[PDB]
């Protein structure tokens, strides 16, 4: 079931993601962002633990600087981690609940966040189109374009 009670920021990687996306940061902390990639690549629970922490920081957050820092952590992890992580991040539920819901009208984020999310959805769809087990993001990308949403590039 989805009735999970452990705080997403308490796991090993969750502790680093919390610090890497705290609003007191002036800019990205690249040492922490890469340490997060290492934990995802090297440990069994890192991939799923990382997605729960990133989702905690992004969902319902009106501090859009924290949202940006977390989207940068996500961007970094897809570029610097492997298929084990890609299969979890490309899922329909993760992409809909963390990326699409962040840009729906109801949430009304600033342009910098809208553009960051569009770029992630489109870049991931392009990179993952060739893999049959990474379709969730590709389907959402094509559906958003079919509905009228404009993308860059």
From Swiss-Prot:
It comes from the Eukaryota. Monoubiquitinated. Residues 20-152 form the VHS domain. It is found in: Cytoplasm; Endosome membrane; Early endosome membrane. One of its GO terms (biological process) is protein transport. Found in a complex with TOLLIP; interacts (via GAT domain) with TOLLIP (via N-terminus); the interactions leads to TOM1-recruitment to endosomes and inhibition of TOLLIP binding to PtdIns(3)P. Interacts (via GAT domain and the C-terminal part of the VHS domain) with UBC/ubiquitin. Interacts (via clathrin box and C-terminus) with clathrin heavy chain. Interacts with MYO6. Interacts with TAX1BP1; CALCOCO2/NDP52 and OPTN; the interaction is indirect and is mediated by MYO6, which acts as a bridge between TOM1 and the three autophagy receptors. The modification N-acetylmethionine is found at residue 1. Widely expressed. Highly expressed in skeletal muscle, heart, placenta and liver. The modification Phosphoserine is found at residue 11. It is linked to Immunodeficiency 85: An autosomal dominant immunologic disorder characterized by early-onset autoimmunity and features of combined immunodeficiency such as hypogammaglobulinemia and abnormal T-cell function. Clinical manifestations include atopic eczema and recurrent respiratory infections in the first decade of life, autoimmune enteropathy, growth failure, autoimmune oligoarthritis, interstitial pneumonitis, and EBV viremia. The GAT domain and the VHS domain are required for the interaction with polyubiquitinated proteins. GO terms for molecular function: clathrin binding; clathrin heavy chain binding; myosin VI binding; phosphatidylinositol-5-phosphate binding; polyubiquitin modification-dependent protein binding; ubiquitin binding. The keyword Oxidoreductase does not apply. Belongs to the TOM1 family. A motif (KRKK) lies at residues 48-56. The chain holds residues 1 to 153 of 492 of the full protein. The keyword Chloroplast does not apply. Adapter protein that plays a role in the intracellular membrane trafficking of ubiquitinated proteins, thereby participating in autophagy, ubiquitination-dependent signaling and receptor recycling pathways. Acts as a MYO6/Myosin VI adapter protein that targets MYO6 to endocytic structures. Together with MYO6, required for autophagosomal delivery of endocytic cargo, the maturation of autophagosomes and their fusion with lysosomes. MYO6 links TOM1 with autophagy receptors, such as TAX1BP1; CALCOCO2/NDP52 and OPTN. Binds to polyubiquitinated proteins via its GAT domain. GO terms for cellular component: azurophil granule membrane; cytoplasm; cytosol; early endosome; early endosome membrane; endosome; endosome membrane; extracellular exosome. Its main location: cytoplasm. This is Target of Myb1 membrane trafficking protein.
């Amino acid at each position: 079931s989805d009735f999970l009670l452990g705080n997403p920021f308490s796991s090993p990687v969750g502790q680093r993601i919390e610090k890497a996306t705290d609003g007191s940061l002036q800019s990205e902390d690249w040492a922490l962002n890469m340490e997060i990639c290492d934990i995802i690549n090297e440990t069994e629970e890192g991939p799923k633990d990382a997605l729960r922490a990133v989702k905690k920081r992004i969902v319902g957050n009106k501090n859009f600087h924290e949202v940006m820092l977390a989207l940068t952590v996500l961007e970094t992890c897809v570029k610097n981690c492997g298929h084990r992580f890609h299969v979890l991040v490309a899922s329909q539920d993760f992409v809909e609940s963390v990326l699409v819901r962040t840009i729906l009208p109801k949430n009304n984020p600033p342009t910098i966040v809208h553009d960051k999310v569009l770029n992630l959805i489109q870049s991931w769809a392009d990179a993952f189109r060739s893999s049959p087990d990474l379709t969730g993001v590709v389907t959402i990308y094509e559906d958003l374009r079919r509905k009228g949403l404009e993308f860059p590039m």
